[PDB]
């Protein structure tokens, strides 16, 4: 997250921290995700496309810190890693959405608590109007040039951009589709960045907190005329519905 503020898991209790175990024992951070039901985390396919093997991954819930344990956290193996069949990328990542079925060594899913809660999915094709302020959360870079990820969870606020504005050549041209959502800061001073992918774009939609988007792609970070691009969740409900029975 470029700019914004530091936070804890209590302020985004559905946030999932996804790690990969390497051949050798070392564990590295991959991407964020969102708990949508006790056994299901939703993320981005591009986070996993190169290493699609479920056994490599570890998922934490209730975790506020990157490389240290948070009191009350839960650790999970990935029982099933489901990637979107129609994924493709150019610069734009198409159909950038994945599902991770979570199971503890004890064979349990997520137990709701003060630091672990689910996020509601949106109603189909129901998104807030452009200019609406939404929040994004992640352990991603604080500066484009940074080598390290922050140790503490971060969040910021970006504003939804119309398909028409994001369509412009001096923005993203043809790269952005109707299945994607652009969001940015008016001054381009705050944004999601590398490491934030798979994480939640949350909007207040007719009274409730809603998983409107999933961090997907962008050209650099907090760059003028280059918004963050998010998978438009309300366009993938049938896909989410069928696959969450797998």
């Amino acid at each position: 997250i470029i700019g914004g503020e530091f936070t804890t898991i209590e302020n985004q209790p559905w946030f999932a921290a996804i790690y990969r175990r390497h051949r050798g024992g070392s564990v590295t951070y991959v991407c964020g995700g969102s708990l949508i039901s006790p056994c299901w985390v939703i993320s981005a396919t591009h986070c996993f496309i190169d290493y699609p093997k479920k056994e490599d991954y570890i998922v934490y819930l209730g975790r506020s810190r990157l490389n240290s344990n948070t009191q009350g956290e839960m650790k999970f193996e990935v029982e099933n890693l489901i990637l979107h069949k129609d994924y493709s990328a150019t610069l734009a990542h198409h159909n950038d959405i994945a599902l991770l079925k979570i199971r503890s060594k004890e064979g349990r899913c997520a137990q709701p608590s003060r630091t672990i809660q689910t996020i509601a999915l949106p109603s189909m094709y129901n998104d807030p109007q452009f200019g609406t302020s939404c929040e994004i959360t992640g352990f991603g870079k604080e500066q484009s040039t940074d080598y390290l990820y922050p140790e503490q969870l971060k969040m910021t606020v970006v504003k939804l951009i119309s398909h028409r504005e994001c369509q412009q050549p001096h923005y993203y041209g043809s790269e952005v589709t109707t299945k994607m959502l652009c969001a940015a800061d008016p001054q381009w001073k705050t944004d999601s960045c590398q490491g934030d992918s798979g994480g939640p774009l949350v909007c207040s939609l007719q009274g409730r907190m809603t998983l409107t988007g999933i961090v997907s792609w962008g050209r650099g970070c907090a760059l003028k005329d280059k918004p963050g691009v998010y998978t438009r969740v309300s366009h993938f409900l049938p896909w989410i519905r069928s696959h969450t029975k797998e």
Partner: peptide
């Protein structure tokens, strides 16, 4: 900043 430092290329072999 090259593509390997952008959102979209996390956990990629070429990176």
């Amino acid at each position: 900043d090259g593509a390997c430092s952008w959102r979209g290329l996390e956990n990629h072999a070429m990176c």
